Amino acid sequence: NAQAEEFKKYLETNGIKPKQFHKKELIFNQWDPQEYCIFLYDGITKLTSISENGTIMNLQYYKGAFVIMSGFIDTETSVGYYNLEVISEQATAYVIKINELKELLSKNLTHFFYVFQTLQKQVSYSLAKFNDFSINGKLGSICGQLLILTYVYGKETPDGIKITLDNLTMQELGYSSGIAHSSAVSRIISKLKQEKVIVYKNSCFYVQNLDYLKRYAPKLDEWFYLACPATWGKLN
Amino acid sequence: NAQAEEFKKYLETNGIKPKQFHKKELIFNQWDPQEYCIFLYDGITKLTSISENGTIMNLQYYKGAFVIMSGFIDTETSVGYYNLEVISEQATAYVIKINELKELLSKNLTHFFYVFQTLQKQVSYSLAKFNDFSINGKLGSICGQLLILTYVYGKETPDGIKITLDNLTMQELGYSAVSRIISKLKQEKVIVYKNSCFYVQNLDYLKRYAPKLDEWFYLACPATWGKLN
Ligand SMILES: Cc1cccc(Cc2cc(=O)n3c(c2[NH+](C)C)SC[C@H]3C(=O)O)c1C
Ligand SMILES: Cc1cccc(Cc2cc(=O)n3c(c2[NH+](C)C)SC[C@H]3C(=O)O)c1C
Ligand code: NA
Ligand code: NA
Ligand code: NA
């Protein structure tokens, strides 16, 4: 990702060092008075919320490289009571107080544009997810999650599109945003397996019916085509 | 809205003029290769997607003042095949080709940041809506929509907090598995349709079932939230 690589260089040019995080650590949390801009450079994370109940909700997944901002750029206050949790074994991120991101973007329109364009990708992603859920319910959500895993981590092989993510991480991620390990989601995923949309072979998982995923997550498929055309193109 | 007024000033001094649109017009559309930045100054709109078979999906609502961009600021290509449909009787909008926008956000950081903040407000709004639906289902979604309408358009009257939208606009907003939720809300005294208007009589109930949207509105719109808290 050339744009992201230039942004990493711009951060280091202004003296910002990478931090390392491990699975289950919070890169930012909902109780901190200070908000941050996170440039997630490598790894996989999830945005989480807590209900008055104490119940944790998984709201959104992010993978490096991407930008996640916990506060509004102008007011510097929280956009929501959210935590950013690491789900890969390790992650690398740049952690910038929001006031400082402002100074940085204001002196380079190219990098300003890069961060702005990430928010635009988020916005459209959410609408696409909403449209697919509206049409196909949880099946649409789950096919969309698998579709984006296929595009991002998939490699064509004789046995189909191999998902190149450790099995440990990959099973977690098959579960769409929402409550953790829902019974209903498990039964949707294993039904896709039973119908050989995604199959276990020689210790790996292979997507064998990409067209099925595309059929039930059509708006996320359009989203990926429009937002990430080269990655989309590889497998279409 | 002072940030919105300052942005309006900056546009008009850079030659960009307000356009008036009537109900049902598309300020931008899903078949147009040219993408746009819309500064919706006044009125109510909805983002839609129309399928091959004619089915119209309602995806998002917006009210002036707000910013809606149909294209990516860097590539200038579509963010999704969407229309922006006017649902108020009239709307006023500043329509900027996306290539031209880049030049003007460049020369004024303050306005760049205003537009940037709008995207953040949309992102967090979508997440909050998702969160309330995950917790409380369709009841959460409907309470949330009623809650935001109460904060933004509500007027205190002897009959309760009247949602002061042109009746015609209320139909456009959706007012039959939904039909059974509205009836339940009337039965439990949470709302009433009196005469030609809509009245909220138990605001705590709405807040109860749309907690994450309420939190969103507190965080994003503190002055407005504060009028009824
Ligand atoms: C690991 C994972 C699985 C499903 C969905 C997502 C969200 C996601 C993936 C993705 O590839 N991109 C985005 C998202 N969302 C944050 C919209 S924004 C554009 C693109 C990118 O990362 O460049 C993930 C991470
Ligand atoms: C007419 C309407 C009804 C329900 C929900 C919305 C969305 C909405 C309302 C709102 O007041 N605000 C936003 C939205 N969404 C566009 C996030 S962004 C922050 C705030 C504002 O208007 O400044 C609407 C318009
Ligand atoms: Na925080
Ligand atoms: Na291709
Ligand atoms: Na368009």
From TrEMBL, chain B:
This is PrfA. PROSITE patterns: HTH_CRP_1, HTH_CRP_2. Gene3D superfamilies: Jelly Rolls (2.60.120.10), Single helix bin (1.20.5.460), Winged helix-like DNA-binding domain superfamily/Winged helix DNA-binding domain (1.10.10.10). InterPro entries: cNMP-bd_dom_sf, HTH_CRP, RmlC-like_jellyroll, Tscrpt_reg_HTH_Crp-type_CS, WH-like_DNA-bd_sf, WH_DNA-bd_sf. Residues 136-204 form the HTH crp-type domain. Keywords: Activator, DNA-binding, Transcription, Transcription regulation. One of its GO terms (biological process) is positive regulation of single-species biofilm formation on inanimate substrate. The keyword DNA-binding applies. One of its GO terms (molecular function) is DNA-binding transcription factor activity. It comes from the Bacteria.
